[PDB]
Amino acid sequence: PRSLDQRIQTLAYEELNKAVEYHQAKAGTVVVLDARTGEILALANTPRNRAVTDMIEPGSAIKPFVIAKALDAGKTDLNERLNTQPYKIGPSPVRDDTHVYPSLDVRGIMQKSSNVGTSKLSARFGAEEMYDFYHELGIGVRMHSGFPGETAGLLRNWRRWRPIEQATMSFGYGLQLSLLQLARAYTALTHDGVLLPLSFEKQAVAPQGKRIFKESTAREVRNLMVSVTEPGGTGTAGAVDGFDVGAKTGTARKLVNGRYVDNKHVGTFIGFAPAKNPRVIVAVTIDEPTAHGYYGGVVAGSPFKKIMGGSLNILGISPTKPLTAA
Incomplete structure (x- = not known):
């Protein structure tokens, strides 16, 4: 891509490689976007172009869109308090294993x-609507x-x-x-409700978007997504000193031939900063880690954090909250 910023591309490869080494992973991918122009600033893969060719399950990375749709349609608001106890859909349990509330x-x-x-908010829409x-x-x-x-992709x-x-x-x-x-989906969140096509070419202003949400x-x-990294x-593993960072993790069991394998996983971390006025979207996948865990936050959180911090510095964006370190 002619849109690449080689400084961010260099940073991408270095951090990707470090995570792939530490977690002894099969492979890895990084995408960095300009959060307002949709320019592709980095597109990095371990030795095929997985960023483009490899469809993955987004996992929890999809959840902010469900929440955004529910709010945008007025099906929920910032005051509603939902029951988060386990429940069943026929025989299938749906429960929260992350928290005590x-x-x-x-x-x-x-x-x-x-x-x-999230499932309850999704359920306030028909299947066809979703x-x-x-x-x-x-x-x-x-x-x-x-x-x-x-x-x-698959839908x-x-x-x-x-x-x-x-x-x-x-x-x-x-x-x-x-x-x-x-x-690309994340541009709907960063670009004030407007989904961008993305650009493989240098482009200072995106000329054509498609609104998905209200500003x-x-x-x-x-x-709300800042809560994820705080x-x-x-997603605290993706926290960036001096910035409010909006993010999600993803963890999926790998698919081999239609079905899931219990002992192979793909870990993902995606987000944007500064949260209020986004500069870049950074997305990392680590494919089949075999050391030090496999959860998206655990394997992809660190390279995200370093690619994000490093990118904000390169791009001349300064901290919005007190730094706690250098």
Whole structure:
């Protein structure tokens, strides 16, 4: 891509390699976007172009979009406190294993990455509505980069779902997209509600977007996502000194031939900073770590944090909150 900033590209490879080494992973990928122009600033892969070719399950990285849709449609607000106790959809249990609370507001649902809370907000929409929404985010929609072997992704026809499936998709499983498509989705949050096409070319202003959320909604959701990286959140491993950082983790069991394997995992970390006025989106996947854990926060949190901090410095953006270190 001619859009690449070689300084960020260099930083991307170095940090990726360090995480891949430490976790003794099979492979890894980094995408860095300009959060307002959609320019592709870094696109880094261990020795094929996985960022473009490899569809992955987004996991918890999809959850802010469910929350954003619920808020945007007025189906919830910042005052509602939802029951977060376990429940069942037919025989299938849905429960929160991340936290101790029997209820959470939407901020808490975000912070704790609540399955119970997110699935309930998704459930306030019909299956077909949610299918259209995922498609609208670009899921199943080719990017037409021109890169060989590019994936469209996977989005199952809504007529084929079960009620368990809709909830499962609200957790980010059963649907799939490339890391580049996921980073694209995040532009709807960073660019004040407007989904960007992305640009492989230098471009100071994106000329054409597609609104998905109100500005107010996107701003609100960005503010909520800061809870993810602050103490009490599930993404503290991605915290960046001096900045409010909006982020999510992803952890998926790897798919081999239709089905899941219990002992292979893909870990993902994605986010943006500064949260109020985003400069870049940074996305990292670590494929099949075999050392020091496998959770997205555990394997991808550190390289995200270093690529983000390093990128904000390179790009001349200064801290918005007191630094606690150098």
